[PDB]
Design a protein around this motif. Structure first.
Motif, PDB file in Angstrom:
ATOM      1  N   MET A  14       5.846   4.576   1.424  1.00  0.00           N
ATOM      2  CA  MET A  14       4.726   3.676   1.707  1.00  0.00           C
ATOM      3  C   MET A  14       4.913   2.899   3.006  1.00  0.00           C
ATOM      4  N   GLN A  15       6.162   2.544   3.314  1.00  0.00           N
ATOM      5  CA  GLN A  15       6.428   1.830   4.558  1.00  0.00           C
ATOM      6  C   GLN A  15       6.137   2.701   5.773  1.00  0.00           C
ATOM      7  N   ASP A  18       2.167   2.722   5.946  1.00  0.00           N
ATOM      8  CA  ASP A  18       1.671   1.454   6.469  1.00  0.00           C
ATOM      9  C   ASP A  18       2.123   1.185   7.901  1.00  0.00           C
ATOM     10  N   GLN A  63      -3.535  -4.726   9.506  1.00  0.00           N
ATOM     11  CA  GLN A  63      -2.264  -4.225   9.007  1.00  0.00           C
ATOM     12  C   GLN A  63      -2.474  -3.965   7.520  1.00  0.00           C
ATOM     13  N   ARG A  65      -1.266  -2.643   3.680  1.00  0.00           N
ATOM     14  CA  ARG A  65      -0.096  -2.581   2.814  1.00  0.00           C
ATOM     15  C   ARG A  65      -0.513  -1.989   1.479  1.00  0.00           C
ATOM     16  N   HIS A  66       0.191  -0.946   1.053  1.00  0.00           N
ATOM     17  CA  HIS A  66      -0.076  -0.269  -0.212  1.00  0.00           C
ATOM     18  C   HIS A  66       1.018  -0.661  -1.201  1.00  0.00           C
ATOM     19  N   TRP A  67       0.732  -1.666  -2.024  1.00  0.00           N
ATOM     20  CA  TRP A  67       1.673  -2.126  -3.035  1.00  0.00           C
ATOM     21  C   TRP A  67       1.627  -1.220  -4.258  1.00  0.00           C
ATOM     22  N   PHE A  68       2.796  -0.945  -4.833  1.00  0.00           N
ATOM     23  CA  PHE A  68       2.916  -0.182  -6.067  1.00  0.00           C
ATOM     24  C   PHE A  68       3.448  -1.074  -7.183  1.00  0.00           C
ATOM     25  N   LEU A  88      -2.270  -1.419  -5.181  1.00  0.00           N
ATOM     26  CA  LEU A  88      -3.200  -2.431  -4.698  1.00  0.00           C
ATOM     27  C   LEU A  88      -3.114  -2.448  -3.181  1.00  0.00           C
ATOM     28  N   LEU A  90      -3.759  -3.957   0.449  1.00  0.00           N
ATOM     29  CA  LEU A  90      -3.951  -5.201   1.177  1.00  0.00           C
ATOM     30  C   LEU A  90      -4.417  -4.863   2.585  1.00  0.00           C
ATOM     31  N   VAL A  92      -4.772  -6.853   6.058  1.00  0.00           N
ATOM     32  CA  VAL A  92      -4.404  -8.094   6.728  1.00  0.00           C
ATOM     33  C   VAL A  92      -5.073  -8.115   8.093  1.00  0.00           C
ATOM     34  N   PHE A 101      -8.237  -7.962  -0.435  1.00  0.00           N
ATOM     35  CA  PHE A 101      -7.660  -7.038  -1.406  1.00  0.00           C
ATOM     36  C   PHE A 101      -8.653  -5.973  -1.869  1.00  0.00           C
TER      37      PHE A 101
END
Lengths: 131, 126, 115
Positions: A14-15, A18, A63, A65-68, A88, A90, A92, A101
């Protein structure tokens, strides 16, 4: 040990996404990798996945961000690993501290091992909780 | 095994910070431990880190939560997502922001415990 | 260190939570109660199932800390409305668990409720 390995796999994966490392992200897939961004037809192969990522990226000062969360694993009959995670997104915006979100997603993954012991993603199907 | 230990390390460390246990949080750094809240000079030593935290707007009506996600270890250098929650008394919906990257350097303690040599936080909106 | 718990147990707890919360959020209230032995206050699985009884909810966890195993985790509830991409958030909670994997009790406090 497998659970921590999948979480680490997702952390690096994911990093890259992103960080706009679309080729590196596609490299975590099998070479016949399958990716369904939304219920458009699914993209195939790393080059196809890379193309899909560039296109949905043009819309983006931003920016992402794909949170798991809550990864749940199980072994398939063919040795594959079925993974289901919450995600989820994000978004930014430059000089805006509060992110906006959405979408909230379910990530359905098929993971494979292979001869060298390294994991790879056969397929990823993303559904949207609001759809 | 190391990956789960780092997640555990972060779980205890952040719960200390969010519980206003600033000295306990600083204790997760090395003696020469370094903390940089943003690209502000960086704090040095446990007392310097503790002092910086004490000085920095809020407990009678505010509860903070520092969520982490997608920890990735590499060579121990650690990079994780962070999302700050600000919870107001009698308000169910938290306020969100900033979204951060946490750049950590992990080393081995004398007791065998994990410790942070350095922590650098960047903000996604800057 | 000498007092630290095994790392395999920590990953096992995260996996336990992953399967557990997905049943709850999928409105599999009996399956969620089946992860209890247990009090939640409601008692035993049948009482927990009853209490639990358009919208799609998600219960995110974070920063699990272990110490019978005492577990404390952050939790953030998401409420997703049909055709609305941005979820509604809240409450933010602390999840106090006792693990024996199975639960006797889960104590949830709300970060916005002050003494």
């Amino acid at each position: 040990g497998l659970y921590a390995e999948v979480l680490s796999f997702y952390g690096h994966q994911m990093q890259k996404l992103d960080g706009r490392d679309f080729a590196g992200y596609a490299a975590t897939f099998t070479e016949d990798g399958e990716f369904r961004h939304s219920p458009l037809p699914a993209a195939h192969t790393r080059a196809g996945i890379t193309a899909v990522l560039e296109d949905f990226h043009r819309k983006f000062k931003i920016q992402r961000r794909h949170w798991f969360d809550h990864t749940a694993l199980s072994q398939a009959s063919d040795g594959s690993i079925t993974a289901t995670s919450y995600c989820l997104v994000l978004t930014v915006h430059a000089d805006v501290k509060a992110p906006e979100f959405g979408p909230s997603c379910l990530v359905h993954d098929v993971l494979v091992r292979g001869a060298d012991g390294e994991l790879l993603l056969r397929s990823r199907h993303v559904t949207h909780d609001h759809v």
